């Protein structure tokens, strides 16, 4: 992962890339979201949309974004290199991400990472030869009470075990999609031993409103 670009035959300014017309309409909605005189504020969502169209960011989406939004291409390069969610290298179809921060390392995410590594036959930062998986290691993903967890594309898979995540990878290899949620008895974030709080029904409107309102 280098922060300088060399013009490969697969990644050059002459690489064909353009937005589909519905993506052009979405881009114009994104631009219309922001005030006039600040059309440069739409660099992030248009670039994200270009990635979701293409799967990765060559140096043809960045200059296309710079031409569409009327900004210097150096600013688009800065934005692409600053943020970790922009893939400047072609990743596989399924971008597996394993969070190994302390709230997840305490609940043994290393076992999950080792199980994935010895299931797919690759290491961290490596892709499968048939371009179907990509395993990288990330920071905290905002589901620390559901630790350990992985994220595959837009789907959060939480409360995982090595056998369960091996079955998840097997489901993805067959073309199926799994259910993006916790895999234990809990549903979203409640304790596994039942609800300690909020067992009463909500009181509905008009309850406890102060006088004079």
């Amino acid at each position: 992962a280098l922060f300088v670009h060399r013009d490969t035959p697969k990644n050059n300014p002459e690489t064909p890339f353009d937005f589909t017309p519905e993506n052009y309409k979405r881009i114009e909605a994104i631009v219309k979201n922001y005030p006039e005189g600040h059309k440069a504020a739409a660099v992030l969502p248009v670039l994200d949309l270009a990635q979701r169209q293409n799967g990765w960011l060559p140096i043809s989406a960045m200059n296309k974004v710079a031409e569409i939004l009327q900004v210097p291409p150096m600013r688009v390069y800065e934005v692409a290199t600053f943020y970790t969610m922009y893939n400047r290298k072609p990743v596989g179809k399924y971008h597996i991400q394993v969070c190994t921060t302390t709230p997840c390392m305490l609940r043994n995410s290393d076992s999950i990472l080792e199980a994935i590594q010895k299931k797919l036959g690759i290491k961290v930062g490596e892709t499968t030869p048939d371009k179907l998986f990509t395993l990288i290691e990330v920071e905290c993903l905002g589901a620390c009470v559901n630790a350990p967890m992985v994220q595959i594309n837009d789907n959060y898979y939480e409360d995982l075990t090595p056998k369960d995540i091996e079955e998840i990878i097997d489901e993805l290899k067959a073309g199926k999609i799994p259910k993006p949620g916790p895999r234990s008895g809990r549903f979203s974030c409640e304790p596994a031993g039942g609800l300690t709080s909020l067992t009463e029904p909500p009181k509905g409107p008009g309850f406890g409103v102060q006088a004079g309102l």
């Binding site: 005189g37 900004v71 210097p72 150096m74 600013r75 800065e78």
Partner: protein, 85 residues
């Protein structure tokens, strides 16, 4: 800016030639490397006039106070918006 505090008196640069043996810079000026430091302009002028040297005085150039503000980098309707920070 600590080197721009004192006035200096120097002399004009005369001929320097190459040495036939070793290529060093030979000169015939005794006053080639001689400079003098004065606290004010008037003392330098008095010292130059005392020794009978014709002098040229060039005035001290000091930078004008600018108007620097951090909030101008993020103006709402001005051209002084920074492209990146």
């Amino acid at each position: 800016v600590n080197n721009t505090k004192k006035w200096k008196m120097e002399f004009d640069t005369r001929e320097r030639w190459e040495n036939p043996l070793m290529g060093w810079a030979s000169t015939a000026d005794p006053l080639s490397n001689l400079v003098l430091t004065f606290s004010t302009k008037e003392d330098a002028i008095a010292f130059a006039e005392k020794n009978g040297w014709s002098y040229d005085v060039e005035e001290r150039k000091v930078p004008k106070p600018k108007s620097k503000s951090y909030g101008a980098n993020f103006s709402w309707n001005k051209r002084t918006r920074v492209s990146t920070k």
